[PDB]
Every structure is written in structure tokens, then in C-alpha cells.
Paper text:
SARS-CoV-2 Mpro is a cysteine protease that acts as a symmetrical dimer and displays positive cooperativity for substrate turnover. A series of potent reversible covalent peptidomimetic aldehydes and nitriles was designed as Mpro inhibitors. To examine the detailed binding mode of the compounds in the series, crystal structures were obtained of SARS-CoV-2 Mpro in complex with the 4-methoxyindole containing compounds 1, 3, 5, and 7. The overall binding pose was similar across the four compounds and in line with what has previously been characterized by Hoffman et al. The P1 group inserts into the S1 pocket of Mpro, and the cyclopropyl moiety inserts into the S2 pocket, whereas the indole maintains its position across these analogs.
All four compounds show a covalent linkage to the catalytic cysteine, Cys145, with contiguous electron density between the sulfur and carbon atoms and the C-S bond distance 1.76–1.77 Å. At the warhead position, when the group is a nitrile (compounds 5 and 7), the resulting imine nitrogen, formed following covalent attack by Cys145 thiol, forms a hydrogen bond with the backbone nitrogen of Cys145. At P1, the installation of a methyl sulfone moiety at this position results in hydrogen bonding to the imidazole of His163 as in the case of the γ-lactam, whereas the other sulfone oxygen is hydrogen-bonded to the side-chain hydroxyl group of Ser144. Substitution of γ-lactam for a sulfone at P1 led to a 10- to 20-fold decrease in potency for the aldehydes but up to a 750-fold decrease for the nitriles (compound 5 versus 7), suggesting a greater dependence on P1 for nitrile binding. Compounds 3–9 showed clear evidence of reversible binding, whereas the more potent aldehydes formed a kinetically stable complex with Mpro, with compounds 1 and 2 having estimated half-lives of >69,300 s and 30,500 s respectively. X-ray crystallographic studies demonstrated covalent binding, even for the nitriles with micromolar affinity, whereas no covalent binding was observed in the 13C NMR study for the most potent nitrile, compound 5. The lack of covalent binding offers a plausible explanation for the observed SAR where nitriles showed a greater dependance on the substitution of P1 versus the analogous aldehydes despite the similarity in the binding mode observed in the X-ray crystallography studies where all compounds were bound covalently.
Residue numbers in the entry:
A (entry chain B), B (entry chain A): 1 to 301
């Protein structure tokens, strides 16, 4: 038993991290087979960054302007191209540590592991959720761009995030591995705001089940609610709507605990309307929304 | 920026995880050079577990009663011995993925990453701390014994924990890699109680320094204290007393902020005496105690 924020083991991804240098800019890249993926703003000077015309800037580069380092070994760049905000450097060497992998675009509310990397060297791993406003609350320092987020399923790594940006509020923005930003962000050097964020309701409910499985039950009550009446209250509090698909994916946790999904919704509605009254759930003073139902099932079954 | 519970990248440890089976019992082992380390209760039947005579049980075992597997690949066992609560199996293959490593015995308050493994297969990685009562608030399911906790310092893995048991309250107990339990626990199938837990004072102070570094400093006051007066008050609030080593490891944070250690102690003491008065620190109403001063230095520099 027990419940922790848990990331996927990172070794399959660690074997793919390299360092990419262009000019005086150094960031991380992802080496799969014979291609290195990295943020295209590596080609920018600080002047370019303000309003970069990326196609022009890239045409002016040669293969030799890119220095790729895997460990102590320089990889020779024999081609380059651009897919949206991601630069692809073809190298003359295939990565022997390439795992089975896919590039996927995740949905808001879904979680993934982030391998934070500096100068091509992995430094830490932690778990994140894509927020409804398409930011992530990460932990990143200068030189972290090109760090990736991923999930692992059997032996296949699904890469879903590459890091590009920190907003003035301190949350983070990035792209999928096809180079498309999550959210309304652009890779230029400007202060950018996100839309108003909301709370991931199906995740809060999954975490309330995790708390029950681990013996926290002070927040339960004898009541049930309708799904529509629950959603009226949830929206009032800036929570995302709960769909019937969400009710279904919570099925295994309802089964395990014997607590119907709409019974647990009546508890969540009482917590929104009354607060926690100085108490905690799983050691948290706040309702936690970055565990999906699958995360909880994986950990508690 | 951003401030998160972060685990170390787990690849170096993943390359060392194997499974060890004796009879029908399978747990995890750690394969370093040509030795596999694992919990000695793998040799027990359920009848043995209530009051095992490990010396006598081991004398009756031979090398050929132990099945060690890397994946489905058997490693032949060619010697065996017991060191306290850890079994050491010498195998005929030196692990080519052995990292530089050390075995260390950590102090209460120190944090580490846990790689949760089942049948020798890594499932997840998370960060936790050793509590003052020598338990960890981990996350483990059946078959997790032998999972290890570790820190990584440059390219060197310091192994500090091997998982052995879950107490009735749902917290976890285990050994260092020399087989010595943290705390007064024994590897038999009995209900064992941990001492009343306390708050890790050096870690709370590290987190207050993190708050100051980030501009959240309303709690700083114009007082100081002696170390002994602070320790005496700390104990009255179920906080651990500070050691000289705690004062030393807070030094870099003291220097960076300009706030003397004992001045920060006086600030914490006022917080404990008076409460938060409806204010928060780093967005939280609760004082965090599972970030060490090293963790803060890593994420705030
Ligand atoms: C990547 N290595 C780096 C992020 C580092 S972090 C702070 O997330 O650890 N990316 C950047 O520095 C981007 C580069 C731009 C092409 C996207 N820039 C920003 O993240 C950035 C710029 C600004 C500005 O510019 C005026 C104002 C406020 C915030 C901000 N963030
Ligand atoms: C190892 N794979 C397993 C821990 C799995 S967990 C629950 O942490 O995910 N270890 C055990 O089951 C140990 C084996 C003993 C040599 C140590 N036993 C316990 O953890 C254990 C036994 C008991 C009893 O026994 C009556 C009562 C209450 C709690 C308890 N815990």
C-alpha cells in the first residue's frame, strides 16, 4: 500500500539524450535511430529570438554549424530539416540504445514523466500532467530545453512532450515531437500568458479513491448525486466537467472500494462547498488533480 | 524555475535489477559485478516466516536451489552467503551494466529515490525520505521486496535502502545494502510498531530557505536563538533537534540568502509557537519536510 507521485523508469529515454550546440546556444536533443530531435530555437542568436524567421535562419545554416555530442563522442551531422518547432539532425550513426517508440500527442488531464536534462545529461525525473490550459507545472532550469516527456507501455516509449519555454507565471510550455505547441504559445522571446486553468475533476476523483484504498475516509458521506447536478457544482468551482466516459474509466476503482462513482462525486461536492476544515488527504492540504485513474489503478492494484 | 519532488534518473539502477527465486518465492535482487544482493527471507517457506532460523535454513540450501534471472535469462549461482538480513549470491557473469557504486547507510531525514520493481522488472520511480522513526512512507505492492533506494552523485550510485516489509500502519521498513535494518525491525512475519514519528527540522529549514530564495520571506523576524534553546523548543512541538551536521549542510543556503542558520531557526520557532495566521509559504499552508538542503540546492541553482 501507499501512494506516491511516481514516474516511469527513465533508462530507455536516458540512452537517447544528447547535447546539441549551435553557436553559443546549447540544449538537449533526442537521438532515435539516426536522427536527433531538438528545439529549433537552438539556431537563434539572442537578437533572432525576438522575432525569428525560422525558415530563413535555417537555410543559412550548414551541417557543420551543429555540434552533437553523445557522451564523450561527437556525432557527425549529415543532414538537417525542420518540422514545425522541432529541428531534425540526421547523423551518420544509429543509436544502439533506441527503444521501441512512438510519437503521440497527449490530451489535457493526461500525465507523463519528464526527464529533465542539462547539456545532454539526465538530471532528474518527475511526473507531470498536461493542464487544461496546455501548460505543465514542471521543474526546469536554464539549458533544459529539449528535455522530453513520455509514457512507457510494455516496452514501447511514447514521447509526448519536448520542453521549449517558461511563462512569466513560472509554468512551462512545449511541443509534441512533431513540433506542434500544446496551447497558444509561440517560440519567440516574449512574455506569454496562458488561458485560465481549471481543475481536472476525473483525476481528483481518482485520487479520492486512492485515499480510500489507503485508509483515508473522513471525507465520505452517505449521499449520492446525479452526474448533471455534480457537473453544475463542479463548473461553478472551475472544475472540468465529468463525462460518462470518465465515470466508466473510474469503474475499476469504484469496484475495488465499493463506492459508486456518483457517491464519490457527492463527497467531492461537499469538499468543494465546505473545504477541508484543516484536515488533509494523503498528506495533502489541497485536492490533488495530477493522478489519472490509470495511474491510481497501476499503483493500488 | 518550479519546485518539485524529483527522483534521480533510474537507468543506472534499472540495469542492475534481477529476480531471485527460491522454491515458489520470487523477489528482486541487485546485480553488481558478479554478486546479487536480495532479502534473505527469499529462502523461507510461509511456515518458516513466523520464527525463522535463517542460519539453519541457509545451511540446508545449496547453490543450485537459487534461480537468478535477468529477464528470462538465468545467471548460474556459484556461491552464497548471508550478511545480516541480506543474501549474497555469487553468479558466473559480471554485470556489464554495473555503475560506479557505493553502499551507504543514510540518516533520518535524508531523501532517496526508490525504483519499485516486480519480478526483477522496474515499474516506477519515486522520491521519499527516511523518517525519524526509521520508516519510509513508500508505495509498494506484493512482490516488491528487494526494490532499492539510492542517490546518484556524479556518475556514482549510492545504494542506501533495500525494501523488506510493510508495517501495520502502511509505512515501510528495510535495510541498508549490508543487511542492517533501519530501526528496530526484524525480518519475521510479526506485527511491528514504529516509534512515534517527528518532523524533520533540517528539511523544514531547507524549505524555508527555498522560499526566501524565491522571494517569499514574510516569516523572517528580527530575532536569533542558540542552537540548544531551539532544540529544546523544537522537541516540544514534535520536531527533531538539529545536529552540528544539520547546521553544516544548511551553510550553502545560509550563504546564498545571507540569513544565518540560527536566525532562520528563530523564524521557524516563531512559526511553531504562533502558527501561520492564515498565511502560506510557497503556496502551502503546511511546512514541507521531505526536501533536504541538497534537494533545494539542486532545484534552486
Ligand atoms: C530552454 N532552454 C529555455 C527554457 C529554460 S527554463 C526557464 O524553462 O528552465 N527556453 C527559453 O529560454 C525560451 C526560448 C524562446 C524560443 C522560445 N524563452 C522563454 O522561455 C521565455 C522568454 C521570456 C520573456 O521574454 C521577454 C519574458 C517572460 C518570460 C519568458 N520566457
Ligand atoms: C516483500 N515482497 C513483502 C513486502 C511487500 S509490501 C506489503 O511492502 O508491498 N514483505 C513481506 O511481506 C514481509 C516479510 C517478512 C520478512 C519481513 N512481511 C511483512 O511485510 C509483514 C508481516 C506482517 C504481519 O504478520 C503477521 C502483520 C502485520 C503486518 C505485517 N507486515
Amino acid at each position: 500500500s501507499g501512494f506516491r507521485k511516481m514516474a516511469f523508469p527513465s533508462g530507455k529515454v536516458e540512452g537517447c539524450m544528447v547535447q546539441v550546440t549551435c553557436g553559443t546556444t546549447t540544449l538537449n536533443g533526442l537521438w532515435l535511430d539516426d536522427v536527433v530531435y531538438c528545439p529549433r530555437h537552438v539556431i537563434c542568436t539572442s537578437e533572432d529570438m525576438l522575432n525569428p524567421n525560422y525558415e530563413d535562419l535555417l537555410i543559412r545554416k550548414s551541417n557543420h554549424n551543429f555540434l552533437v555530442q553523445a557522451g564523450n563522442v561527437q556525432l557527425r551531422v549529415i543532414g538537417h530539416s525542420m518540422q514545425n518547432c522541432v529541428l531534425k539532425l540526421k547523423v551518420d550513426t544509429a543509436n544502439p540504445k533506441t527503444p521501441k517508440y512512438k510519437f503521440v500527442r497527449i490530451q489535457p488531464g493526461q500525465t507523463f514523466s519528464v526527464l529533465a536534462c542539462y547539456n545532454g545529461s539526465p538530471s532528474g525525473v518527475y511526473q507531470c500532467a498536461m493542464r487544461p490550459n496546455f501548460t505543465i507545472k514542471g521543474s526546469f532550469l536554464n539549458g533544459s530545453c529539449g528535455s522530453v516527456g513520455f509514457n512507457i507501455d510494455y516496452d514501447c516509449v511514447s514521447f509526448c512532450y519536448m520542453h521549449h519555454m517558461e511563462l512569466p507565471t513560472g509554468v512551462h510550455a512545449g511541443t509534441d515531437l512533431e513540433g506542434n505547441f500544446y496551447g497558444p504559445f509561440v517560440d519567440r522571446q516574449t512574455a506569454q500568458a496562458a488561458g485560465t486553468d481549471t481543475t481536472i475533476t476525473v483525476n481528483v476523483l481518482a485520487w479520492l479513491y486512492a485515499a480510500v484504498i489507503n485508509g483515508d475516509r473522513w471525507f465520505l458521506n452517505r449521499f449520492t448525486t446525479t452526474l448533471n447536478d455534480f457537473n453544475l457544482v463542479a463548473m461553478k468551482y472551475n472544475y472540468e466537467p465529468l463525462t460518462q466516459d470518465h465515470v466508466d474509466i473510474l469503474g475499476p476503482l469504484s469496484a475495488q472500494t465499493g463506492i459508486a462513482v456518483l457517491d464519490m462525486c457527492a463527497s467531492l461536492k461537499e469538499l468543494l462547498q465546505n473545504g477541508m476544515n484543516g484536515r488533509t488527504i494523503l498528506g495533502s492540504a489541497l485536492l490533488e488533480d495530477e493522478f489519472t485513474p490509470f495511474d491510481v489503478v497501476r499503483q493500488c492494484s
